[PDB]
């Protein structure tokens, strides 16, 4: 959960944006 | 969007209002939309009152006044700083400035 | 002009109840209006009302309880058959537990439950709940 | 383009076309 949060907030709109938000809680 | 509820003019319940000419540019502006001032000044400025009063033949002459009705288009009235742009809330105020 | 005075009566009642008023003046009165109000009052939605008689077209002062969520007219008065009444109450009523559709039928003006009991179809006047 | 001048150019084109047509 923390790793997903870190990946999302590193680049909140980059290539890894939709996937991380979906992986958060879905 | 609609900036003003009266469209910046005083035309209600009529179709056409005769236009007048701005005193600066001679632009055709409707008489209700135009910005109208009524200057009532002394024909002699307050600096030149003493000389003409001293040189006056008639004691207690009370010097006359210049009455001028000035019409301004919105552009010329903005440029001449007679009116200024106001905030969205202060726009609605219609009270003339206290002076 | 003023057509379908039942629409005006029901709209006035609805607006007066939205404002929380205790009494509403309906004018002009009519036989259909009085029958509709009576059907309303038998179910406790509207309470007593009084017909003021002026010599041209009566008025009605209707007392109001806060029991009416909505009273509405259906225009035009569609001819509803008894087999097609279930669809009409599915469209118009909030649930099957409460709410009424008023039909004007050959047996008089009455709710949809009475029209089903009396096995009479008719023309839909309105609804209330 | 301004719409008024777009319409003016369209009208001029139509006038030229109808001149070319007899």
């Amino acid at each position: 959960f923390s790793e997903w949060i870190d990946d999302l907030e590193a680049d909140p709109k980059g290539k890894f944006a939709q996937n991380l938000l979906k992986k958060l809680t879905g | 969007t609609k900036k003003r509820r009266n469209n910046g003019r005083a035309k209600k319940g009529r179709g056409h209002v005769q236009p007048i000419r701005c005193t600066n540019c001679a632009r055709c502006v409707p008489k209700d939309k135009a910005i109208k001032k009524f200057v009532i000044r002394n024909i002699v400025e307050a600096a030149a009152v003493r000389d003409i009063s001293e040189a006056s033949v008639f004691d207690a002459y009370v010097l006359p006044k210049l009455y001028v009705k000035l019409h301004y288009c919105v552009s010329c009235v903005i440029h001449s700083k007679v009116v200024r742009n106001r905030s969205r809330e202060a726009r609605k105020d219609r009270t003339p400035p206290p002076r | 002009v003023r057509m379908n005075v039942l629409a005006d009566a029901l709209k006035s009642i609805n607006n007066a109840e939205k404002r929380g008023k205790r009494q509403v003046l309906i004018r002009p009165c009519s036989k259909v209006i009085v029958r509709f109000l009576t059907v309303m009052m038998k179910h406790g939605y509207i309470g007593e009302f009084e017909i003021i008689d002026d010599h041209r077209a009566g008025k009605i002062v209707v007392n109001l309880t806060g029991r009416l969520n909505k009273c509405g007219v259906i225009s035009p008065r569609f001819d509803v058959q008894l087999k097609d009444l279930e669809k009409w109450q599915n469209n118009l009523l909030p649930s099957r537990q409460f709410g009424f559709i008023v039909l004007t039928t050959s047996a008089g003006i009455m709710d949809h439950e009475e029209a089903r009991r009396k096995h009479t179809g008719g023309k839909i006047l309105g609804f209330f709940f | 383009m301004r719409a008024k001048w777009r319409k003016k150019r369209m009208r001029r084109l139509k006038r030229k076309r109808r001149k070319m047509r007899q």
């Binding site: - | - | 225009s75 035009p76 008065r77 569609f78 | -």
Partner: protein, 141 residues
């Protein structure tokens, strides 16, 4: 507002049928001009003869070359540009061999960055392009 009268059925129906012609899909499906302008003539696939190979430049935000083929349909003799889908599949295609060509999936609308290409090659020389791509079959001798 809309007319609500017991005898307005003619007015309601006429208004509905007149207003339907302002709908894009209804007009394109019923006016008939879209069917005539359709290269396939209303079909789902079409067989054509490859006039030539060609490379089209993709739309600006992304850059590549799409290996399409200009073919001529057998049924109506129209000229079509059909996108050879995969990589190395243009090598499977030669000049002047019949190809079965389908739509691109958007009903005459161009697909993706490819400009003005609404067709894709499905089969070449009577053998599917997928079979050639996966090595299941070879080009007939």
């Amino acid at each position: 507002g809309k007319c609500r009268g017991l005898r307005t059925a003619r007015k309601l129906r006429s208004h509905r049928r007149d207003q339907k012609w302002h709908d894009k899909q209804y007009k394109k499906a019923h006016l008939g001009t879209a069917l005539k302008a359709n290269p396939f003539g209303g079909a789902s696939h079409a067989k054509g003869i490859v006039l030539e190979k060609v490379g089209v430049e993709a739309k600006q935000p992304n850059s590549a070359i799409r290996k399409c083929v200009r073919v001529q349909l057998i049924k109506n003799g129209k000229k079509i540009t059909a996108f050879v889908p995969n990589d190395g599949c243009l090598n499977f295609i030669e000049e002047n061999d019949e190809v079965l060509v389908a739509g691109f999936g958007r009903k005459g609308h161009a697909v993706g960055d490819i400009p003005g290409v609404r067709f894709k090659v499905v089969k070449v020389a009577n053998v599917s392009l997928l079979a050639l791509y996966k090595g299941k079959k070879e080009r007939p001798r």
